[PDB]
């Protein structure tokens, strides 16, 4: 399917 990922802090 599809997804928007917003990554946690580096």
């Amino acid at each position, epitope marked *: *399917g*599809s*997804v*928007q*990922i*917003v*990554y*946690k*802090p580096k």
Partner: nanobody
Amino acid sequence: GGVFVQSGGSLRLSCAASGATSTFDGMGWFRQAPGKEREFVSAISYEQGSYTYYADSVKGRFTISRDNSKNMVYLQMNSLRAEDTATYYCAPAYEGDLYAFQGTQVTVSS
């Protein structure tokens, strides 16, 4: 339309949090300011003491919390500044990363 806050003011956001599944172990927030990329804000685990992540831009000002009895997550936004102007989105988390498969617009004056 959206929320309007004076600089130095505060705001609390809330979102339903159904609870941990095999896919997700927490909930958090990201934001998108006009003409900018999505920015991580904060994420919290359903498990007490597992993660509590914050963007460096909000550390000390924002506090994420959860109430597993109420199936709710909260974001307390204190000492707001004009750079916090954005639309805020809640999303399920897996190890702190947010997965979005309905925002709150917030304007802060300086």
